[PDB]
Amino acid sequence: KPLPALKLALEYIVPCMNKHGICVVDDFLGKETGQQIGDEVRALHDTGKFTDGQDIRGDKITWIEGKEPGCETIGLLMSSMDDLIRHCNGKLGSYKINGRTKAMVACYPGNGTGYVRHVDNPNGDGRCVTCIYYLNKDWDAKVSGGILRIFPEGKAQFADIEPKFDRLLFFWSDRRNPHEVQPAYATRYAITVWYFDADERARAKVKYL
């Protein structure tokens, strides 16, 4: 029996994020839904829908709104992420979360591709929580690499996150969590949504021309 979403949010995600600034939920959606999402992602890849994510990053990406034909299960993943954030009921830090990005479907196509150490939102662009879902059946970093290494500020030790199938990850998007995607030696897929704090986003520190 999977934990209900409300209980998972209030009794784990909230306290875990407030304590550590990083939170992993394994077995988020189960094997059938996870494999369905994998099929949808591989279909997007196989039909040539990705573009360069860019030296700094070697991923290939596409943005998914959730209602597109062939992306129904990705849309279900996005609505499930949204439900969890809603259940958190403003207890994630002092943020007032009111919006998010589309889903960034990303592939590191093996061959040692990765993402150098970076902060997702270093310039106050409104993004407060990074939420990533991994869909790599049988991934083993021993063989394929691709660890997400996070370097939380104020801690001497780093946190290694393998991109395991059906794994959901949250972390604060600001400077507290610099991170890198270590070289990947197999096709590594993940889906990211970023959630916005309404006030920070409204300050418009970033203008997109």
């Binding site: 784990y12 875990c16 550590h20 939170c23 992993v24 939920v25 077995d27 189960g30 946190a159």
Partner: peptide
């Protein structure tokens, strides 16, 4: 159903 609170991983099942 167990969270080791010094860690940041929990399985939902």
């Amino acid at each position: 159903x167990v969270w080791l609170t010094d860690t940041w991983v929990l399985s939902r099942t």
